Design a protein around this ligand. Structure first.
Ligand SMILES: *[C@@H]1O[C@H](CO)[C@@H](O[C@@H]2O[C@H](CO)[C@@H](O)[C@H](O)[C@@H]2O)[C@H](O)[C@H]1NC(C)=O
Ligand SMILES: *[C@@H]1O[C@H](CO)[C@@H](O)[C@H](O)[C@H]1NC(C)=O
Lengths: 49, 48, 48, 49
């Protein structure tokens, strides 16, 4: 999932954008994937309970 | 040849050229123009 | 040929466009880290 | 005027008009890659006249 960024591939976005402009899309991917992982662990906790 | 032209077409009929089957080294672009706006959107000029 | 000088002359003349004008640049680098500071602005020294 | 800084650094040089936009953390150009480059997490001000 692109998560509203340039692309969903970390390596491709790093190789296509410089650090001090790409870190914004990096943070976008970070927060999207991190919210996804939080949802997954919350649902897994529900299922485990 | 794109930046060496003398009769750049008007914006109403903007000339459009295709660039393929070559090696793009943007040093010639950097030294071929006194840039005023180099606003890149999809790719950073640094790693171009 | 194939032995180029590392640095070339940065020549100037008063007749240059804005993209070639002699711009003077000074940068001011700070360190906003936790250490005994040395510089401030306007200050007051109210008793603790 | 209301902050405190450990040590202040002032680098004075002369560059071109396009180089004014060039001089920034992690940027393009022979100048920004061989002559002088700012750190990516730069915290300061740039003055050009
Ligand atoms: C857009 O500008 C190009 C500049 O290179 C033109 O290409 C050239 O066209 C001439 C003929 O006019 C060729 O002889 C030359 O080899 C080169 O291909 C291109 O034609 C132009 N396009 C339009 C629509 O004006
Ligand atoms: C190409 O550019 C150079 C320098 O920018 C100039 O001297 C030359 O006249 C140009 N050629 C044409 C055909 O415009």
């Amino acid at each position: 999932s692109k998560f509203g960024a340039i692309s969903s591939v970390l390596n491709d976005i790093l190789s296509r954008l410089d650090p001090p402009e790409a870190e914004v899309q990096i943070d976008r991917l970070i927060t999207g994937r991190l919210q996804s992982l939080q949802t997954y662990v919350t649902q897994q906790l529900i299922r485990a309970a | 040849e794109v930046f060496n032209a003398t009769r750049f077409a008007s914006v109403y009929a903007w000339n459009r050229t295709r660039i393929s089957n070559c090696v793009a080294d943007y040093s010639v672009l950097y030294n071929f123009a006194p840039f005023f706006a180099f606003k890149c959107y999809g790719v950073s000029p640094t790693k171009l | 040929p194939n032995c180029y000088f590392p640095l070339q002359s940065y020549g100037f003349r008063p007749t240059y466009g804005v993209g070639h004008q002699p711009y003077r640049v000074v940068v001011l680098s700070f360190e906003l880290l936790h250490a005994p500071a040395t510089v401030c602005g306007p200050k007051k020294s109210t008793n603790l | 005027n209301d902050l405190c800084f450990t040590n202040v650094y002032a680098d004075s040089f002369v560059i071109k008009g396009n180089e004014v936009s060039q001089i920034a953390p992690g940027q393009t150009g022979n100048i920004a890659d061989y002559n002088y480059k700012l750190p990516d997490d730069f915290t300061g001000c740039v003055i050009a006249w």
